[PDB]
Amino acid sequence: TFGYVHGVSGPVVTACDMAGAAMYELVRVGHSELVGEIIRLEGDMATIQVYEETSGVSVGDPVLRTGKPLSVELGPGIMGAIFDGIQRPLSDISSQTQSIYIPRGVNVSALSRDIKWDFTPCKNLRVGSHITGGDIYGIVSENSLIKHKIMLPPRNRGTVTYIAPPGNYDTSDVVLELEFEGVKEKFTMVQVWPVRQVRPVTEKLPANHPLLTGQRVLDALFPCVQGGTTAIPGAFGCGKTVISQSLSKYSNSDVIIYVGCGERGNEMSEVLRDFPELTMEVDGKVESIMKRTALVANTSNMPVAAREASIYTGITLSEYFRDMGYHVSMMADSTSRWAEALREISGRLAEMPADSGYPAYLGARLASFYERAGRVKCLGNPEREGSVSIVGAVSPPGGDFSDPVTSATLGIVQVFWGLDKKLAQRKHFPSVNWLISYSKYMRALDEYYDKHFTEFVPLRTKAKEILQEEEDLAEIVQLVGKASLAETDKITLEVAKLIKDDFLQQNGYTPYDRFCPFYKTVGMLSNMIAFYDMARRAVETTAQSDNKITWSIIREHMGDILYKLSSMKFKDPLKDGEAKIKSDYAQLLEDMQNAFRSLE
Amino acid sequence: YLSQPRLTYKTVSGVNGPLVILDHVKFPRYAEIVHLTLPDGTKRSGQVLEVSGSKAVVQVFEGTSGIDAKKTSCEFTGDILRTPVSEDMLGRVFNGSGKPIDRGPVVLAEDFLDIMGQPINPQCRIYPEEMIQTGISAIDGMNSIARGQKIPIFSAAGLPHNEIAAQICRQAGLVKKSENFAIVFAAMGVNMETARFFKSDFEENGSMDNVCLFLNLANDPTIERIITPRLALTTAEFLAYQCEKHVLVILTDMSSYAEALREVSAAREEVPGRRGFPGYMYTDLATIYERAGRVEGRNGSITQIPILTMPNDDITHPIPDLTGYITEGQIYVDRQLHNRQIYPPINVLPSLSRLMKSAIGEGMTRKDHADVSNQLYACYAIGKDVQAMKAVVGEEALTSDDLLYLEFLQKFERNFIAQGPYENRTVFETLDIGWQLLRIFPKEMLKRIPQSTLSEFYPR
Amino acid sequence: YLSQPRLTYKTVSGVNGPLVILDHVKFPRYAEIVHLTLPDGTKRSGQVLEVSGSKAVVQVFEGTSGIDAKKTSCEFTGDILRTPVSEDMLGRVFNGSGKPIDRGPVVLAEDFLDIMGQPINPQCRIYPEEMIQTGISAIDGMNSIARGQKIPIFSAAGLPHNEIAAQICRQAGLVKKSENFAIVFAAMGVNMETARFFKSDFEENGSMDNVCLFLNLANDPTIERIITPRLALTTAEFLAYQCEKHVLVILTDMSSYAEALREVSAAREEVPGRRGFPGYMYTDLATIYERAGRVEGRNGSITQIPILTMPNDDITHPIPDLTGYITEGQIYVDRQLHNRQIYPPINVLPSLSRLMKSAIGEGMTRKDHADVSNQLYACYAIGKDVQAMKAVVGEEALTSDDLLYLEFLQKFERNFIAQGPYENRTVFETLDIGWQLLRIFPKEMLKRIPQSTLSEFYPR
Amino acid sequence: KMGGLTSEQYHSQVVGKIGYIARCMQTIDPENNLKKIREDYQDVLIWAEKNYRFEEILEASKSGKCPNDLDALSRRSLILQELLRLVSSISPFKMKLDLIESQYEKMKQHVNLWKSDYHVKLNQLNQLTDYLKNAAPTPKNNFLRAMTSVLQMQIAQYGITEDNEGINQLFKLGLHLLAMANE
């Protein structure tokens, strides 16, 4: 090892005496050991792109070869940690140096080698067992929520020569040692994986289970699945935090991985303040979400090669926790700020531009990234199954979905929750547009619904029809004068507003509307569409009978039924049980049926 | 045979981009094939892109991540890329480079064929004239397809071009006026949903002992998307011009092929064309599309149906624009018709088939095919003109004939185009529907149909 | 320290452009500082720009005129640009390279700081809370600025943004609830009349003791324009994070900084980028705009106010477009308001402050701030629409409630926006003016003010 | 091997799965008493009952002697794994060799085991069992422990596959008490 510096011109260092140095390997330049990466070889010389500031590097300085590309450390110490695109432990730099800056050429391990971890081996394993790549051979009790499963790296195999008893070990002790063909491998609690390589699985399964968020919209009208791909608009004043807060607090996920890819300086200071404050309830107790969450945090002035490799660090962490058997949901905030760092890294290398200056390989990257999500059957013996759900965020200039990044990401992803600012200014929350949003996972969730909530899909189609009809009846009510209104259309324009105001609108600052279970959702939609059906038939039967019914009689014969409909969304799911709310909704149904028979 | 030992060089002069440069090579041969073994034992393969004296420039199919200039060992094969080809390849699944991914053995070759092919003497061809009946009235009745044609599907992202393709595949057959296709499927850069869809649809709505798949997915090497359609087409040419079968080749997302091609071109700083694509993209797509037709003396054929995705629904982008200059028509899949829940969402005005005039008519389908087609085209265009005039002058400023056109438009889009995804319309049913649509107008408005055809077919 | 003697070289091997190429340099260090002595005796200064073996390429600040390769000497300093910093720098005028231009001595140093600086740990920064009071009601009252924000001013050529900058500089301070404050001013690429105006206006309005002025002129070396904002921000960081003051940093015409960046990029033989400017301009602007904010454990802040001129009044030029991706909000200096003889010509409809919600409220300014601002914005937009309708409908066919939205317009532009270049209005005076304007409408028309506040502040 | 299962990788995974089935068997029945079950898995238990090294069974798989259909092995392994889960969840109590084979062949004939409701009820029972491994003596912890022991014995006496509404009642009662606030 130990080449030397031959020339420096900007961020580009040239190193001599680097004979056996691989491409895209990482190196440390100078006496402060700045981190850089090899981008070209020529004879005995290597061309290095340095990530930090090269100001002060002289000729003859050392160059240390690391031997591996950009990789991540995977072991106990990830939950509640705060990293960046290079996986530097920000909250440990902050406390070991006692300065408010990130030092230049700082070399600290991502997982601390001081904590003693509680490790218990697999009770069936003994000297002579046949263990392959992926097998869980121990468990570290990370915290009260997450059990950390110790797995063999995906490429090893052999017979157990030694396995450690239960006890306390740090992430440097040899906990396993196996043998193959006369060669020994020692393995500790931490394994290293390159971030640009997909982790192996046994098979990629189709996604057929819902991702419960807790909002009535996004769970009825635009469903996502466990293993899916979503995209939202990341803009100012659109009410965007509902998505990440719902995912973190009330969701069926086990592990959460949040990624900022070059956010503003004060926008990161808000996430790093809010996220350690959210809480969940588990087994009756209240715990912090940072017991099952990891954050990757970059700002606009951090190295451009960390604002680009952030997405890969995040997806590798989530693929590491998917291989244990968990269901992970990753969230990448402002994927556009990643695409811009991509374009800038290209520009530095003097590469031919493509449409709008972005590199040639933009759609290839954006597609091979989202192809890393999904449900899988995990490699290894104890027969588990995991999942990774990716939620990206795009920032189109002025709400224009023609930028190359927005066009590509809308071509790829299957769901699209369209947050709107217009609805936010009207105090309509969650401000989802319901007219430009979509979801193409609705045919995969068909055995699930038909097995668990049989009478739901018809209600979904009916509600979508009603909400579309109230909208394409707009010029009819403006260019004409609200009077030439067939009674079917009066019934629509009233019940659709009932839906818009008492189903699609939810308020998190309450004790009853933070979380809406799905039985409550299907009940609240069934009562509304059943009303609609009965009130529509009552009118269109007595069409020519000299007893013309109009909405004016329907709104006077049932003046409390309508209130109780508009009051369905106050039934607490905790202070009232599930059978109680079911019986209340059934009573309201029978009262509706009565008060509709006592009208004919 | 090549009976001499192979030479192995550890003399790498420099790695850069996707290109490795070797020196001290002994009589380097252009387009040769190289086998590289990396310092950690992994194996990759490359092709020589330029030779000069003792230097050779190899382009690795899997990339140059991990290669060094002291321990990577390259072994020169001594010959161009030849693929092993047989007839057992029907009923098998390979990846984009030709290895088995269905837990079976490697191909026991009947022959070894050069995957670049050979341009067919233009004198030894036969003009294709036997019409394929796809059972889709928007293609059969207005953009008819002959057996031997090359006709792509111009679609966009999010539209249903895959189901259109699979329906053509499972419904297609000759016209019965008074035995089957062997499918070769290559996909370049697809996602797992698409491969699952096609595999499930082949082995359910038909048979899988007549299909040969070459699956290169979205998390696979980019530079190996360049040789996948050529492997597919070499297999097709062996099955068609030597074993005398009728092959149907489906190449999915030529856009991903074109983008891998742009990436390799930009890697070594060549002259661009529009929007950065290499200047030789026409001459490169033409070596793929032109391997489709019939020849004199042999009873096989090759019908190609590429599938495209037009960026931003723009048909002037380099990919659709250069594709339309090479192929014999195109089937245009529209977004405006998808948003109205119409299937198949085929817009017939930007569609075309260049071999229709010779495949329809008396003794082939029926005497009146061409006139009905031309009249439907004229009426559809005038209806779409009226539809845009009324958006300015209002509903109540139109004439008595503009309303006839606006009625034709609705009934055409809902009765002729819209079909249903498992419905197989014989071409005579399509022509009867066309005449039922043309009877909206008095026979004097139909100014493209001769009089002796209107005397026989209009009153009925 | 550095106790080894320095080396002088008489080994100049080339001169071209602003670059001198020296050979036989012992261990050339990148970005080092060099002192050149010309054949006759004049002394110039330079910075090492490229290093290769025993060879250095020095960029000379004052040019390469009269430099020959046989008698010019270059003495190498041994280190990089470190500036001296102390608290006595408040009340002084330096030039772009940091030497006194106010007839005073040199800075006696409290420390030597590297002007490149290190990034702030994203985990130590906290959220901006209190308010920075500029004394301009168009900014204070409706586009409030928080302690730690970064909010630019967008203008054009000929518009009066330098007088706005001067008024902000000589009025800004902290809100007097019921003062550790300093200002660092960086003028880049200004002509001599602008520099005279700044210098005299600051030093004669009795305020030049909480100001540090860095003046860079349009005929100064173009390398000093690259290091001017980094000296300004190094001084600001010393003041705020070691002496615990509240610093406001004003940087005038970042467009001139971008032009100097383009020049020193093209000197490195780099191919231009999109529309002229380098491809790495985002990172270079971000290493400037992100040296700001509050931090944990210190009682000081840094607030930044970049000022730009939009070339061709375009909002999508690279400089405004990239400054929008790093900063939080914008102020707009308008040309229709300037031609109508209104000062300051600030357009409040397109302007925004993304962190106003944090700067205002109870205990920071007053409990009625947000509602007064919302109502003033609403009434202003409605009055503009009313003045649009008045031109086609006629002034004799307007309502009585549309005649109120047309008196509010005149009174708002002439009494609230239009201020006076030497008139200091505290936040409470601004809000009282807002209420005097809102009392034009009956209490029942002010829809955006809650009734619990229309009871306390309306009846006065 | 659709995408990443190289020959070396595929056959290493096969050898690992064979070893895992051997270990699950040795744990589910240390003293041979389910002769029917140890007979049904004979072709995969032979390669472990006599000592072959890792490479010997590896070359046996590459040749073709030992089973090498990773999917068949996976679906045969999930059954024994869920059997071990059922007989190790109810640890203090026990089950006798008639109900064991009853439940085993009720699992063997399921369409998809991972989509069954024996899997679901085992998930629920294991949730309850895992909350009580290091709990703190309290009212709700003691109540959960009592109801959990009653549930374990009822499952040891009846079974998990067939419907037994006492077991369902105790299940939903324990799962509602577990998620009840400790205040």
DSSP of A365-429, one letter per residue?
Answer: HHHHHHTT-EEEEPSSSS--EEEEEEEEEE--TTS-TTSHHHHHHHHH-SEE--B-HHHHHTT-S
β-strand partners of B320: none
Asked if A352 lies within 8 A of B276 by C-beta distance, the reply is yes
C184 strand-pairing partners: C212, C249
Number of domains within chain B: 1
Nearest residue to D22 via CA among D1, D36, D41? D41
Contact present, C and A (at least 3 Cβ pairs less than 8 Å) = yes
List chain C residues with CB under 8 Å of A100. Answer: 120-121, 124, 241, 295-298
Q: Which residues of A touch B70 (CB under 8 A)?
A: 19-20
Asked if residue A429 and residue A447 are part of one domain, the reply reads no
Range of the domain at B161: 1-460
Q: Please tell me the distance from the alpha carbon of residue B379 to that of residue B388, in angstroms, as a whole number.
A: 15
Rounded (5°) CA angle D176-D178-D179? 70
Q: Could you tell me which residues come within 8 angstroms of residue A235 by beta carbon, excluding any fewer than 6 positions away?
A: A395, A399, A419, A421
Domain shared by A396 and A468, yes or no: no
DSSP state letter for C272: P
The distance between the two most distant Cα atoms of chain C, rounded to a whole number of Å, is 88
Give the distance from CA B179 to its chain's centroid.
Answer: 22
DSSP letters, C134-174, are -S-HHHHTTS-EETT-B--EEE-TTSSHHHHHHHHHHH-EE
Final residue of a structural domain among A439, A474, A496: A439
Contacts of the segment B127-132: beta carbons below 8 A, 24+ positions apart: B127/B358, B128/B293, B128/B294, B128/B301, B128/B355, B128/B358, B128/B359, B129/B355, B129/B358, B129/B359, B129/B364, B130/B174, B130/B359, B131/B174, B131/B175, B131/B359, B131/B360, B131/B364, B131/B365, B131/B427, B132/B172, B132/B173, B132/B174, B132/B303
Distance CA B117, CA B82 (A): 10
- DSSP for residue C367: T
In the block, residue with structure tokens 């049932």: A558
Question: Do A11 and A64 reside in the same domain of the chain?
Answer: yes
Considering the domain architecture, whether residues A120 and A108 belong to the same structural domain is answered as: no
Q: Could you tell me the end-to-end alpha-carbon distance of chain B, in angstroms, rounded to an integer?
A: 71
CA–CA separation, C240 vs C181, rounded Å? Answer: 9
C106 CA to chain A: closest CA distance, Å?
A: 26
Neighbouring C-beta atoms of residue C89, cutoff 10 Å: 24
Residue A3: count other Cβ atoms within 10 Å of its Cβ: 23
CA D107 to chain CA centroid, nearest Å = 10
Domain boundary among A149, A171, A187: A187
User: Are A410 and A277 members of one domain?
Assistant: yes
- Nominal resolution (angstroms): 2.9
β-bridge pairing A157-163 and A136-141:
unpaired
Write out chain D residues lying below 8 Å of B104, CB-based: none
In chain A, DSSP finds a helix count (H) and a strand count (E) of: 16, 28
Alpha-carbon distance B366 to B368, whole Å? Answer: 6
Tell me the chain D residues in contact with residue B215 when contact means C-beta distances shorter than 8 Å: 2
Cβ neighbours of residue A550 closer than 8 Å, sequence gap 6 or more? A487, A490, A539
Contact: A344, C282; criterion CB under 8 Å: yes
C-alpha closest to that of B295 among B455, B450, B119: B119
Measured between CB atoms, which of A10, A297, A343 is closest to C122?
Answer: A297
Structure determined via: cryo-EM
A385: which 2 tokens? Answer: 């199954």
Residue B256 CB contacts under 8 Å (≥ 6 apart), including other chains = A364, B188, B189, B225
Nearest to B272 among A43, A352, A364 (CB): A352
Query: Scanning the structure block, which residue is given the tokens 């929007």?
Result: B275
Residue of chain B nearest A200, judged by CA positions: B219
Residue type, A89: P
- D178 reaches A (C-beta below 8 A): yes
C92 Cβ neighbours under 8 A, 6+ residues apart = C100, C102, C104, C107, C212, C213
Q: Tell me which residue range forms the domain holding A144.
A: 115-187
Residue pair C156/C335 in contact (Cβ under 8 Å)? The answer is yes
Residue of B nearest to A39 (CA): B16
Residues of A in contact with C53 (CB under 8 A): 6-7, 59
How many domains, in total, are found in chain A?
4
Give D97→chain A minimum CA distance, Å: 23
Chains with at least 3 CB pairs less than 8 angstroms from chain D: A, B
The verdict on whether residue B354 carries a ligand-binding annotation is yes
Task: Find out whether B230 and B164 touch, Cβ atoms under 8 Å.
Answer: no
Quick count: other Cβ atoms within 10 Å of Cβ C129?
A: 15
Nearest CA in chain A to B71: A20
Chains A and B touch (3+ CB pairs under 8 A): yes
CA distance A158 to chain D (A): 6
3-state secondary structure (DSSP) of residue A50: strand
Among candidate residues B126, B246, B273, the one with its CA nearest the CA of residue B174: B246
Chain centroid to CA C145: 13
Owner of token pair 């009233």: A494
Q: Which residues of A touch B (CB under 8 A)?
A: 19-24, 40-44, 69, 196, 198, 204, 206, 351-355, 360-361, 363-364, 367-368, 371-372, 374, 402, 407, 410-412
Which residues on A lie below 8 Å from D50 (Cβ)? none
List strand residue ranges (DSSP E) for C200-345, in order: 211-217, 246-252, 294-295, 301-309, 329-333
Q: What is the 3-state secondary structure (H, E, C) of chain D?
A: CCCCCCHHHHHHHHHHHHHHHHHHHHHHCCCCCCHHHHHHCHHHHHHHHCCCCHHHHHHHHHHCCCCCCHHHHHHHHHHHHHHHHHHHHCCCCCCCHHHHHHHHHHHHCCCCHHHCCHHHHHHHHHHHHHHCCCCCCCHHHHHHHHHHHHHHHHHHHHCCCCCCHHHHHHHHHHHHHHCCCCC
Interface size between B and D, measured as CB pairs under 8 A? 10
Give the burial class of D71: count Cβ atoms within 10 A of its Cβ; 0-12 exposed, 13-18 middle, 19 or more buried. exposed
Q: Which chain A residues are Cβ-neighbours of B263 within 8 angstroms?
A: 360-361, 364
- Cβ distance of C282 and A82 shorter than 8 Å: no
Looking at beta carbons, which residues of chain A come within 8 Å of B309? Answer: 411
CB contact under 8 A, B14 and A354: no
Strands C55-60 and C19-23: antiparallel
